[PDB]
Amino acid sequence: KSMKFRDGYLISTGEPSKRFVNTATRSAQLKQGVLGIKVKIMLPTAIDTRTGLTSILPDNISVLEPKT
Amino acid sequence: KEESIAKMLICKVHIGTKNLENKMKRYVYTRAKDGVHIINLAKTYEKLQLAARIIVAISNPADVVVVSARPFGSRAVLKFAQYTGAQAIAGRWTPGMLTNQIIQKFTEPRLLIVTDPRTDAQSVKESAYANIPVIALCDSDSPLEHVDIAIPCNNKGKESIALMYWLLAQEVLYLKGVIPRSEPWNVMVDMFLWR
Amino acid sequence: MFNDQKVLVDIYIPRKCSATSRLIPAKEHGAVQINVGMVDANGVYNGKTETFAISGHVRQNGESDACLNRLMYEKKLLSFQ
Amino acid sequence: KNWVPVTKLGRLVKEGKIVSIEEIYLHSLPIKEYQIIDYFFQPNECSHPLKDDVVKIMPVQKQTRAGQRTRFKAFVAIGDGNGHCGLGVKCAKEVATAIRGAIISAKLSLIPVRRGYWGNKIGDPHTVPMKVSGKCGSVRIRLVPAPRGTQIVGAPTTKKMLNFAGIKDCFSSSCGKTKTKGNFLRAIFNALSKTYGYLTPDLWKVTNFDKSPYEEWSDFLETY
Amino acid sequence: PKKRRNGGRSKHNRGHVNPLRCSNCGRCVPKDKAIKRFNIRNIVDTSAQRDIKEASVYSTFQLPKLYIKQCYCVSCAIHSRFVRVRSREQRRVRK
Amino acid sequence: GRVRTKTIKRAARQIVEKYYAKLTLDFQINKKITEEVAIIPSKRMKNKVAGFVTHLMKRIQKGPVRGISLKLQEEERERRLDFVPEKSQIDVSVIYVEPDTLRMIKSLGINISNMKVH
Amino acid sequence: VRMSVLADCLKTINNAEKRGRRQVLIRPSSKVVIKFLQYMQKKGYIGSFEIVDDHRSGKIVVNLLGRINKCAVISPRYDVKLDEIEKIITSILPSRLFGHLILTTPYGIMDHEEARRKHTGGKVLGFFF
RNA sequence: UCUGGUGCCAGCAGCCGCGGUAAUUCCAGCUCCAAUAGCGUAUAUUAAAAUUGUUGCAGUUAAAACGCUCGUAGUUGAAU
RNA sequence: AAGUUAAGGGAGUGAAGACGAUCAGAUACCGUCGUAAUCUUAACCAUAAACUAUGCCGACUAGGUGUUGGAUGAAAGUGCUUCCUUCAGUACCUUAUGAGAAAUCAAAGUCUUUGGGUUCU
Ligand SMILES: [Mg+2]
Ligand SMILES: [Mg+2]
Ligand SMILES: [Mg+2]
Ligand SMILES: [Mg+2]
Ligand SMILES: [Mg+2]
Ligand SMILES: [Mg+2]
Ligand SMILES: [Mg+2]
Ligand SMILES: [Mg+2]
Ligand SMILES: [Mg+2]
Ligand SMILES: [Mg+2]
Ligand SMILES: [Mg+2]
Ligand SMILES: [Mg+2]
Ligand SMILES: [Mg+2]
Ligand SMILES: [Mg+2]
Ligand SMILES: [Mg+2]
């Protein structure tokens, strides 16, 4: 059986899923068999980009407050 | 007072309809030959005065909500909230305002005025969840569930709604020291009329 | 209740409906309290008021208006019941 | 705590404007935040703190197209040991979040319980003031007053709930399908709730009305 | 179970009601339970109707109609879509 | 199809709601405003948001737009609709009532002078 | 047919009291109903009541104080000895400190405490909380 | 959820169930629990059973209103 | 309703029976014939989802819309209709700090706050 633990926000599709997500896989050998360990960590959204520069916002289109 | 009844006679506040709805029998004077029920108009004035006293007893006017659902009652409710210090809704009611604390427009009052209990039924339904003294403005076929003080009127005429709200506001101003009696209110009806 | 030493042993005393004497409990949310302002022979509202309590039962049955009318007519606030 | 009140009652309780929870039981006001109950029952400056007990966890299934779909329900009973009681329930995907939700729900439903005497009145009432009956589903329960030394004569769940409520002596009998744990807990809770509604002869005299906290603290609450 | 208050027909204050026979399948059905349809139809359609007008004497002719008054059993009626299957709350909607 | 998701419509309504004065009925002019006002990584959605904003303005000329609230329209409408008549219509020199209603006022013992029926 | 007037009277009183009616009418009256009403009046459970005179069995109008929980008869009038009161009151009454069980006794109609005070038994009539 | 043996066999199990090569339930070793000079098993009987109901059941659809009316015994009968 | 006895009657329909089709088979569904029966008079039999699957008598508790049969009181009439009130049948709609396991119920409500009278299971 497989057990899934999640917390927060994650992305699965597209190019941003390859940049902003970190992945690792390992296995542990018990006396009854072998167990698979899979970890996926979504980094803080900076992930330096094609033009070497931090892409702080992947898709958000925030609007600036007009100067008083 | 004579002239208030005169103005109520000029407008059509005294004509109801069929569907007597027996809990409203004691406010109806008679039935005409075409089947229309007539409202006494001597009890309307007295109930209006008592309603004004109940309203003025509130400490800050912001703890009062006045609601209208129909298009030709929006001007009257907005003006009444302007000259008093209450809050108005005037249209579509969000079904969780009085009972859902996480929502954006919680706005829990201490008293609530209704234009018509048959169309503002969601508002009166939610009042009984938070101990709110509903006061309404009932026609000859209105339901009286969860209604405490009922003013006999007709909810259908634009002139009727404008006149009744104007009278209530003027009386509220008299009970405060803003202007004394024997001097009429300087603002005029047709400021509360629709369109 | 008082014990044998005349010490009150209730944690609180609930209210009663003015129309039926019905002893409103702590979760009844259809119960309301009304304050009616007073005038001072000149038509302006002084600091005084009168209080009534109405239970959720009669308020759900749709009879709060008639009971309130009678209760106010007793207190010299109306001319009919 | 460092929590931001959302309702007027929360703002009033956050400051010392309300002295005891009985002040809001009297006016029949709703309670929407568990921080009020947390504030009124603190481990210090309180003789009797609240206690919890997860009485039951059961799984339920929905059985969609690709196999079943399980999730768990939690029943928790909270009690003061002196005059206060509550009961809550919650369903969720994991047991821990379910018990968290159930604990929150139990606090929000806290009620007072009236206690009385068998025979002559002496210090510290110990039993129910009169016979009470509770009902949920097909389950019916009845509780009757008992003398000083007789402990609770009832099923384990009845003993548990009456121990949270602060009652020391009672006879009981039940009818229906009591193996349904939730309905039987709810029936006991319903019977306990009815004590402060009976109008015994000593409650006949009329008293005048105190004024609501909203009216009393109108100016301070308007200052915000 | 007990999916209808009237039991599928309109009978009150009576013991027995005589039956009639289905217009399509010949079955016996009590009169108070069959669905009744009264149809006023034309002898011919609107195109062949104006051919009869201009081949006619009297210069002002009105073709007669037909009166049928058909009756059906439940099975022979809902297969021909005179009556459909409805939802639980809509089942109570008469006229 | 070319239906615009809520990402486009949310942002575009904010631009109209906050910078009403600068925006006009030309797509190119409205495009340069959006480039520096907002933050959009890709030029394809920069074009689409600006195109929607221009489409919004044309609708404004025919009146209010449901879901967009710019203050300048309400105060200009408020002054129009407060138009006081030079004399009310509440007053009529003769009160006209129904025959059955006339008895109602008479039974109560109150006097209103110019009352006549039909 | 009737077969009893006391049961109907108490049932009507109980039904009116659950609704908050402030007044109710009892169509057939009798001396037993009068004694039972007087006893409820003595313990402060109802207000005054009026007896109407038609030239048939009279009628009664009573004033209610929103104060009765229950009032019912025990139809077979079992006879009770002086030392069997305890079991009956344990079964029938809601507490040991309020409520009344009414007997008819060779010294008149009285509740169980007065019956013990007078050292007598009787037959059972009804009760009221 | 300790260690060996067996492998839908042998067996256990009042009821639900366990056992088909990694058995917390069979056969054993160790360790723990219960009552204790006492502790198991079989049959009968009481409470549990408001599952025989006077206190105190149920009868539209779960078991259950006679096809319908008259009628003797029995039971029950207005107010003074 | 079916079924039995006797005397009549006997068009249509038609358990049985005989054919023609479909089918792997078809002693069935479809079609062509057709005996008892179905109808009347005089006698038996005592059963049905003989169903509102809710025994009978009495009291109390809520608003509205109809309809069948009387009676009272008022208006449009060519001692007649429309309206109002009331009694007796009979349905439907809304809602129940009423009830149920629910479906739902104006009784299937006034039940651990348990007893109006009575028969059957
Ligand atoms: Mg894509
Ligand atoms: Mg039949
Ligand atoms: Mg072992
Ligand atoms: Mg036994
Ligand atoms: Mg037994
Ligand atoms: Mg027992
Ligand atoms: Mg049973
Ligand atoms: Mg029957
Ligand atoms: Mg023959
Ligand atoms: Mg023949
Ligand atoms: Mg033939
Ligand atoms: Mg024959
Ligand atoms: Mg039979
Ligand atoms: Mg039967
Ligand atoms: Mg019983």
Side-chain angles (χ1 to χ4, degrees):
Chain A
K1 201 171 192 161
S2 296
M3 294 177 70
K4 307 194 181 181
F5 304 85
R6 304 175 164 114
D7 172 352
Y9 168 64
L10 202 68
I11 281 177
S12 301
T13 66
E15 186 212 9
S17 82
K18 184 176 181 179
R19 258 188 299 157
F20 292 76
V21 184
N22 184 2
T23 312
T25 58
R26 280 298 185 270
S27 56
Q29 181 195 331
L30 265 293
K31 189 179 178 177
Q32 285 168 344
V34 179
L35 294 179
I37 304 155
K38 205 175 300 177
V39 184
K40 290 182 192 157
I41 303 179
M42 184 177 177
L43 297 169
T45 183
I47 295 169
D48 52 356
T49 316
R50 272 47 180 166
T51 63
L53 268 164
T54 180
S55 297
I56 312 162
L57 278 297
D59 182 297
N60 306 143
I61 298 169
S62 47
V63 177
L64 277 296
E65 190 60 45
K67 185 178 182 292
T68 195
Chain B
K1 185 61 66 65
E2 293 83 3
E3 65 182 1
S4 285
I5 288 185
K7 289 180 190 162
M8 293 183 286
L9 276 165
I10 288 299
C11 317
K12 299 288 97 176
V13 305
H14 67 288
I15 53 164
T17 175
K18 306 92 181 162
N19 297 114
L20 182 50
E21 191 286 317
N22 77 347
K23 282 191 182 297
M24 294 299 291
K25 278 181 57 61
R26 69 183 185 272
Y27 292 127
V28 173
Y29 184 85
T30 177
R31 183 160 83 104
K33 295 311 296 179
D34 48 341
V36 170
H37 291 96
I38 305 298
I39 304 164
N40 189 179
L41 288 187
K43 309 187 184 313
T44 303
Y45 186 62
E46 198 155 2
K47 296 287 284 182
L48 196 55
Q49 310 216 305
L50 276 186
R53 276 164 81 169
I54 295 165
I55 287 167
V56 71
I58 298 276
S59 177
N60 56 351
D63 271 340
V64 163
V65 174
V66 297
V67 185
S68 163
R70 298 308 305 159
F72 63 91
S74 57
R75 179 67 181 271
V77 65
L78 267 297
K79 301 302 272 173
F80 175 86
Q82 169 184 355
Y83 288 145
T84 55
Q87 302 177 357
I89 310 297
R92 159 92 196 165
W93 174 277
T94 300
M97 293 182 286
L98 287 195
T99 188
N100 189 1
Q101 77 266 355
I102 314 300
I103 199 167
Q104 183 62 255
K105 36 182 61 178
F106 196 34
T107 187
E108 48 183 353
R110 280 180 67 197
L111 195 141
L112 188 138
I113 298 93
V114 169
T115 304
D116 173 22
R118 203 168 276 282
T119 56
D120 301 295
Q122 179 72 23
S123 56
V124 310
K125 190 183 61 178
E126 284 181 65
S127 72
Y129 287 70
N131 297 115
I132 308 296
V134 169
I135 171 163
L137 195 144
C138 302
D139 195 42
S140 74
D141 59 336
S142 310
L144 293 195
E145 270 86 351
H146 301 286
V147 166
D148 289 302
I149 295 90
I151 296 90
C153 299
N154 62 332
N155 297 115
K156 313 308 196 279
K158 35 168 181 288
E159 299 87 4
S160 194
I161 304 177
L163 177 59
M164 291 301 305
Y165 275 106
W166 190 81
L167 282 175
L168 188 56
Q170 172 190 96
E171 179 74 5
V172 166
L173 272 69
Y174 291 168
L175 278 71
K176 300 201 247 189
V178 292
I179 42 170
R181 305 184 135 92
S182 73
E183 294 92 10
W185 198 15
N186 50 297
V187 75
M188 65 180 288
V189 183
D190 292 331
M191 295 298 102
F192 299 178
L193 214 59
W194 169 83
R195 166 65 57 78
Chain C
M1 294 182 286
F2 298 88
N3 59 354
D4 63 358
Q5 293 179 357
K6 307 180 156 305
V7 183
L8 190 142
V9 285
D10 287 19
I11 71 166
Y12 88 111
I13 305 302
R15 310 171 276 161
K16 304 168 211 170
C17 167
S18 286
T20 63
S21 297
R22 203 177 257 262
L23 201 64
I24 294 93
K27 299 289 94 175
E28 215 190 349
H29 298 315
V32 299
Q33 268 203 1
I34 322 296
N35 299 309
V36 187
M38 304 304 276
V39 298
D40 63 358
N42 190 359
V44 298
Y45 157 74
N46 51 8
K48 298 292 180 68
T49 192
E50 309 260 353
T51 314
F52 315 95
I54 303 287
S55 85
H57 170 71
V58 64
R59 186 162 137 84
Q60 177 203 111
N61 275 334
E63 319 181 299
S64 61
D65 184 61
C67 298
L68 263 179
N69 278 7
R70 166 178 77 80
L71 276 176
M72 284 187 291
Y73 167 76
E74 301 187 344
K75 288 262 164 283
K76 297 296 191 287
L77 295 157
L78 278 170
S79 58
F80 58 93
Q81 43 174 3
Chain D
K1 283 298 301 303
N2 66 258
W3 70 291
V4 192
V6 180
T7 60
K8 285 154 81 174
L9 208 52
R11 274 151 216 152
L12 291 193
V13 169
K14 182 67 181 294
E15 281 58 53
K17 325 303 281 198
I18 290 165
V19 292
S20 80
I21 196 178
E22 271 74 11
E23 200 175 328
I24 63 173
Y25 285 163
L26 171 70
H27 292 103
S28 294
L29 306 177
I31 305 180
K32 292 284 183 67
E33 295 146 323
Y34 71 101
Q35 279 96 354
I36 295 90
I37 295 91
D38 273 345
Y39 171 86
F40 277 128
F41 291 86
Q42 295 189 36
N44 63 7
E45 65 267 12
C46 188
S47 47
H48 313 85
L50 283 170
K51 301 178 292 295
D52 291 314
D53 189 358
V54 178
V55 311
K56 170 90 153 158
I57 51 176
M58 73 173 145
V60 296
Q61 310 180 305
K62 201 193 186 260
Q63 191 272 330
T64 64
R65 174 192 277 271
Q68 283 73 240
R69 199 286 306 270
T70 81
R71 62 176 65 189
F72 308 91
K73 289 179 73 172
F75 296 104
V76 306
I78 195 173
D80 187 15
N82 177 320
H84 299 93
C85 199
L87 169 83
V89 64
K90 164 93 178 171
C91 195
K93 193 174 299 173
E94 294 294 328
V95 294
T97 185
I99 75 173
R100 187 175 311 126
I103 285 176
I104 285 178
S105 313
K107 279 175 191 162
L108 280 191
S109 74
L110 206 74
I111 60 153
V113 173
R114 197 182 174 195
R115 298 180 289 167
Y117 295 98
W118 187 96
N120 48 21
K121 298 135 86 196
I122 206 163
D124 291 331
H126 58 109
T127 181
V128 296
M130 87 293 288
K131 299 184 194 169
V132 291
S133 172
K135 156 175 63 175
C136 185
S138 89
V139 179
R140 283 91 172 96
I141 185 65
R142 203 196 203 186
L143 314 162
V144 304
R148 280 309 291 239
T150 301
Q151 320 277 272
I152 296 156
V153 183
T157 63
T158 66
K159 288 169 71 167
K160 175 146 293 295
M161 289 283 302
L162 287 193
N163 271 332
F164 286 110
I167 281 166
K168 318 280 205 290
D169 304 304
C170 203
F171 307 122
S172 70
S173 83
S174 68
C175 182
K177 185 153 186 148
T178 58
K179 286 182 217 168
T180 295
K181 264 275 188 74
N183 287 349
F184 182 67
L185 283 156
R186 175 76 51 183
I188 289 147
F189 190 57
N190 274 345
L192 282 171
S193 301
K194 273 177 186 156
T195 57
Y196 265 110
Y198 209 88
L199 191 60
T200 58
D202 48 6
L203 282 175
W204 284 0
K205 66 181 297 213
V206 297
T207 77
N208 46 6
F209 302 115
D210 298 6
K211 51 172 46 170
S212 174
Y214 299 152
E215 172 183 8
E216 183 178 1
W217 302 111
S218 187
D219 285 345
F220 156 81
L221 188 62
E222 196 197 347
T223 300
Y224 267 50
Chain E
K2 184 83 179 139
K3 88 183 297 188
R4 277 180 195 103
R5 162 143 183 146
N6 66 351
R9 56 162 158 176
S10 61
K11 167 163 87 60
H12 297 98
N13 211 39
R14 295 177 192 86
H16 178 250
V17 170
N18 271 331
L20 57 83
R21 299 181 73 79
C22 185
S23 297
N24 190 37
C25 45
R27 183 177 176 87
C28 286
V29 287
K31 196 188 170 191
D32 62 358
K33 183 176 172 177
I35 63 170
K36 274 80 73 176
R37 297 292 181 262
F38 190 46
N39 306 108
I40 312 301
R41 292 183 291 113
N42 291 282
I43 306 290
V44 289
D45 66 20
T46 174
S47 173
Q49 154 168 355
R50 65 181 294 276
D51 285 356
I52 298 174
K53 298 291 180 68
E54 46 173 68
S56 160
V57 307
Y58 310 127
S59 73
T60 187
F61 188 63
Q62 297 305 78
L63 284 68
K65 324 282 270 194
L66 293 186
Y67 309 70
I68 313 293
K69 190 42 150 53
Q70 286 144 339
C71 299
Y72 302 95
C73 82
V74 163
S75 296
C76 292
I78 62 171
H79 164 83
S80 311
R81 300 164 187 184
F82 303 130
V83 158
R84 287 187 156 91
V85 164
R86 299 195 281 183
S87 65
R88 178 184 289 279
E89 69 275 16
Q90 283 303 297
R91 274 175 198 145
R92 313 180 61 211
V93 169
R94 294 182 149 244
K95 65 178 72 66
Chain F
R2 296 175 185 176
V3 186
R4 320 183 176 103
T5 66
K6 59 183 161 187
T7 65
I8 286 165
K9 291 189 174 164
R10 276 161 53 200
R13 286 196 205 105
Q14 305 188 352
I15 283 167
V16 174
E17 206 151 17
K18 284 172 182 179
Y19 297 80
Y20 181 83
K22 285 190 161 192
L23 316 174
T24 61
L25 309 188
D26 169 81
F27 163 73
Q28 305 287 341
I29 289 172
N30 287 340
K31 171 159 69 178
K32 273 82 74 176
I33 288 171
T34 312
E35 301 167 346
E36 61 86 20
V37 158
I39 175 65
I40 309 164
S42 73
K43 76 183 285 185
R44 202 175 141 216
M45 306 278 165
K46 167 205 63 177
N47 288 337
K48 298 197 174 197
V49 169
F52 193 56
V53 161
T54 308
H55 166 65
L56 276 185
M57 295 296 172
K58 297 183 180 69
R59 288 199 62 210
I60 283 171
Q61 306 301 318
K62 275 74 70 178
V65 173
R66 172 189 217 175
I68 307 172
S69 61
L70 268 299
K71 62 177 181 64
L72 293 170
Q73 292 291 291
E74 292 83 3
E75 286 83 4
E76 66 91 15
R77 273 161 162 290
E78 175 64 29
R79 79 180 75 191
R80 262 174 56 121
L81 188 153
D82 275 350
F83 173 36
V84 57
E86 197 204 308
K87 173 64 186 297
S88 69
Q89 68 270 15
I90 62 170
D91 63 320
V92 167
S93 294
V94 62
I95 297 89
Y96 267 55
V97 292
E98 303 77 21
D100 189 359
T101 294
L102 184 148
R103 188 177 67 195
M104 200 258 276
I105 311 303
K106 186 180 289 293
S107 80
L108 299 191
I110 189 170
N111 46 0
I112 304 178
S113 66
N114 46 353
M115 293 177 70
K116 70 167 299 163
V117 69
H118 172 267
Chain G
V1 289
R2 280 274 174 190
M3 305 269 186
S4 193
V5 299
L6 190 55
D8 287 3
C9 182
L10 272 67
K11 183 65 91 182
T12 308
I13 295 278
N14 197 52
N15 278 7
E17 182 65 26
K18 285 176 180 181
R19 302 209 53 189
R21 266 294 182 269
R22 267 177 80 71
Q23 264 186 355
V24 74
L25 188 151
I26 300 301
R27 178 147 83 76
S29 86
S30 80
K31 53 172 76 168
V32 184
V33 178
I34 310 288
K35 295 305 197 159
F36 206 99
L37 291 184
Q38 275 183 120
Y39 213 83
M40 270 173 311
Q41 210 173 52
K42 186 178 183 69
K43 303 292 182 181
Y45 275 87
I46 52 161
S48 75
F49 62 97
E50 182 66 26
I51 294 158
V52 182
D53 184 340
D54 47 8
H55 285 333
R56 313 144 179 73
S57 299
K59 282 179 261 203
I60 302 174
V61 182
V62 303
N63 301 348
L64 306 167
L65 313 166
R67 187 175 287 174
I68 291 166
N69 286 299
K70 180 86 172 184
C71 51
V73 303
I74 309 293
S75 166
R77 303 187 182 174
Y78 306 113
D79 47 54
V80 176
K81 291 189 180 70
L82 173 61
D83 46 348
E84 310 161 345
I85 312 282
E86 182 65 26
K87 294 186 193 297
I88 304 281
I89 67 183
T90 304
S91 182
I92 286 287
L93 287 185
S95 175
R96 286 176 60 90
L97 312 184
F98 68 90
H100 307 280
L101 174 76
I102 312 303
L103 311 170
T104 182
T105 288
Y107 311 139
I109 285 165
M110 64 184 73
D111 71 347
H112 60 284
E113 289 304 347
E114 181 179 338
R116 271 153 163 192
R117 211 175 309 128
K118 305 263 183 83
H119 204 88
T120 177
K123 304 163 180 272
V124 62
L125 270 180
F127 61 97
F128 61 94
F129 292 169

